[PDB]
Design a protein around this ligand. Structure first.
Ligand SMILES: CO[C@@H]1[C@@H](OC(N)=O)[C@@H](O)[C@H](Oc2ccc3c(O)c(NC(=O)c4ccc(O)c(CC=C(C)C)c4)c(=O)oc3c2C)OC1(C)C
Length: 168
């Protein structure tokens, strides 16, 4: 992972969302660059499984995040999963789970998906600023290579919003 800036980190989180679209489960991926320079990636896929992983004995989502690159390079990572009518939440800080998986709400059974919100640890990057032009260029190409998915990008730092969808 490149540490010139947090873009590559974001693209890896975006790729996990797009993989759900490519598999035919997600129809939309939303990316939001927050005012505090944190990035949030939301998809309407199946939702990162929250049931126990046999070998490890911990929620699959907890395990995936624990070993993820976002967790390693972010001072904070908050994940919300919509699955089976339930909204599960879990968070890590400085690389450590600071909030066990827990049901924070309910939702429609058909409303599934995952939200990954992370705050890069500025100490690991030459620059903590996200390169917007680079983020949008890669996203657009992503929309192109995954026909049918609607990709939106909301920039709350430069106050702009865009959406792209390539039907075929
Ligand atoms: C970083 O997590 C990624 C996902 O990222 C997002 N945003 O959804 C996505 O890329 C992909 O997500 C998958 C990949 C495979 C299945 C999949 O095979 C499912 N089918 C099941 O019936 C199932 C139900 C519960 C369960 O614990 C598992 C196995 C666990 C896995 C695949 C982590 C499978 C399912 O419900 O959801 C899935 C999901 C959401 O792979 C992950 C979990 C590594």
């Amino acid at each position: 992972t490149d540490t010139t800036r947090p873009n590559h980190l974001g693209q890896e989180v975006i790729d996990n969302s797009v993989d759900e679209a490519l598999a035919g489960h997600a129809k939309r991926v939303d990316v939001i660059l927050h005012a505090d320079q944190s990035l949030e990636v939301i998809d309407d896929g199946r939702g990162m499984p929250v049931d126990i992983h046999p070998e490890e004995g911990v929620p699959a989502v907890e395990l995936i995040l624990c070993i993820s690159v976002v967790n390693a390079l972010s001072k904070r990572v908050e994940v919300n999963v919509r699955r089976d009518g339930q909204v599960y939440n879990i968070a890590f800080e400085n690389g450590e789970k600071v909030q066990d998986l827990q049901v924070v709400g309910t939702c429609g059974k058909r409303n599934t998906g995952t939200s990954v919100h992370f705050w890069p640890d500025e100490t690991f990057f030459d620059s903590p600023r996200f390169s917007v032009s680079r983020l949008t260029h890669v996203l657009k190409a992503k929309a192109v290579l995954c026909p049918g998915v609607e990709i939106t990008f909301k920039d709350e730092i430069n106050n702009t919003e865009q959406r792209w969808c390539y039907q075929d």
